[PDB]
Structure formats: structure tokens, C-alpha cells
Design a protein around this ligand. Structure first.
Ligand SMILES: Cc1ccn(O)c(=O)c1
Ligand SMILES: [Zn+2]
Length: 257
């Protein structure tokens, strides 16, 4: 099955998931010079004050911090979006070295990691019906650079040793995702896809311009997780990023001058 190694990595995924070579695949390189300012975009609204985290899961590709999405609680709206999108989970993609790890790139620059806050369009009722639609998801992408620690990340980092291997989960209540956001909500946006199989083309991407800083010790702890299950040969969970895909017939719009 799919993964990020030599025999099952991104260059193989098209055989099981032909949409890998589709018309609106993600991630992409964001050419900042050619991303046009769009004065019709609204400011983004991130309303996370009532977010209810439940659990943290090592799914064998990343760790997901899961939310109760059964009520109207942690929503993204405004910006490029029509309607209301509800937070379901976040996770990260990261590198084996600080010089790589992000999926989107900015003028070919790779950041050390990328945070994805995944939301589904509430007009479709739940996540599973939303991934059957071209406007079913909105993913808020936030770059991570290595420098100062992010204090709001530390509760996540401390729980990782309890979910080292694939299939492990842990209770993870009362985590506030507002502590992972940068000061500015200036963003780029374009239509694209999930960046892991099943690679579905559902996503309005909203990628913030301002990265957050995490410490080298925080990202080192991400790199101690495992892609394998307990009792299987240890393969460190590193380099779980897909490289940039062809832009094709798409425009990237900027919310800022
Ligand atoms: C639903 C989904 C699956 C994989 N990734 O990376 C995402 O950002 C979102
Ligand atoms: Zn992701």
C-alpha cells in the first residue's frame, strides 16, 4: 500500500489512484510574483473558540488531532469560501531535515513542515459526503520554520511518545488550535486536492503567508514517530510530504497587496 518510500511513494500513487495525474492536484509551488491580488476576497474568519478536540491518532502517514464535528463549533468562513466549513482534524507533514518538509512551496522554498487544518463544507452534511464534491473541503495550510518554540504546540509534542506507532491513539481533549496560528491571516488560495491518497479534488486551499516558528526540539519529536505498527521493523515517520504538482489551468490568488 501507499506510503512515502522508494517503492510506494508519490511517484507510484497514480497506479492505484489515477487522479494523481488529474487537473487540480496538490500541493503546488506558489509563485509569489504571479499570484494576483484579488480585492474581491473577504478577510478570512477563523472561529475556533468553541473547538472540541477528542483524540490524537497515528494513522501510519501522520498524526491527526481529531475534533468533535457533530455541532456548529470550530468553523472557517469568509476568504474565498461560500458558506461554512467545519473543522474535523489537523495534522502536519514534515521532513527528515529542517531544509525540507512542507508540501506547498513559496518561490520553490521548502519549509520544515506544514500544518493542515481540515474542514468540510457543512452544506454536505458530513465529511464523507463532502469528499464527493468539488467544493467539499477547505484546508488551511500553515508553514512551520525552525526557530523559537511555539508554546501552543507543546501539548501535542508531549503526547507523541504515547502514539509512536501506526494505529495507536490517545485521548486528547481541550486542545486549543488557536495557539497554532500566526499573527496575520494574509493568504494565497487556489483549487486543488488532498495531498495523500485518495488524492480527491475537493479542496479550496487557503495557505497563510506568515509561517509559525517551532523549535528544533519540537520538530525532532515529530521525527521520532514511526510509520510502522508496534512489533514491526522501525521506519521513522519523516518526509511524509508530496512534492509540488503541475499547476495546469489554475490561478493562485493573494488576499493581500
Ligand atoms: C483529508 C486529508 C488527508 C490527507 N491530508 O494530508 C490532508 O491534508 C487532508
Ligand atoms: Zn495534509
Amino acid at each position: 500500500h501507499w506510503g512515502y518510500g522508494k517503492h510506494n511513494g508519490p511517484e507510484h500513487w497514480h497506479k492505484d489512484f489515477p487522479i494523481a495525474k488529474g487537473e487540480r492536484q496538490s500541493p503546488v509551488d506558489i509563485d509569489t510574483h504571479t499570484a494576483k491580488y484579488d480585492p474581491s476576497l473577504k478577510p478570512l474568519s477563523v472561529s475556533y473558540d468553541q473547538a472540541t478536540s477528542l483524540r490524537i491518532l497515528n494513522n501510519g502517514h501522520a498524526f491527526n488531532v481529531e475534533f468533535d464535528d457533530s455541532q456548529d463549533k470550530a468553523v472557517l468562513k469568509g476568504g474565498p469560501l461560500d458558506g461554512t466549513y467545519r473543522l474535523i482534524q489537523f495534522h502536519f507533514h514534515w521532513g527528515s531535515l529542517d531544509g525540507q518538509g512542507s508540501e506547498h512551496t513559496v518561490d520553490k522554498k521548502k519549509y520544515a513542515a506544514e500544518l493542515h487544518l481540515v474542514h468540510w463544507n457543512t452544506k454536505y452534511g458530513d465529511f464523507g459526503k463532502a469528499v464527493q464534491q468539488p467544493d467539499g473541503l477547505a484546508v488551511l495550510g500553515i508553514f512551520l520554520k525552525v526557530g523559537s518554540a511555539k508554546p501552543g504546540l507543546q501539548k501535542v509534542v508531549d503526547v507523541l511518545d504515547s502514539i509512536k506507532t501506526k494505529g495507536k491513539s490517545a485521548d486528547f481533549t481541550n486542545f486549543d488550535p488557536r495557539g497554532l496560528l500566526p499573527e496575520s491571516l494574509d493568504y494565497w488560495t487556489y483549487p486543488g486536492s488532498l495531498t495523500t491518497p485518495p488524492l480527491l479534488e475537493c479542496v479550496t486551499w487557503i495557505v497563510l503567508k506568515e509561517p509559525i516558528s517551532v523549535s528544533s526540539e519540537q520538530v525532532l519529536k515529530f521525527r521520532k514517530l514511526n510509520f510502522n505498527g508496534e512489533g514491526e521493523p522501525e521506519e521513522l515517520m519523516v518526509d511524509n510530504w508530496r512534492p509540488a504538482q503541475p499547476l495546469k489551468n489554475r490561478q493562485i490568488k493573494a488576499s493581500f497587496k
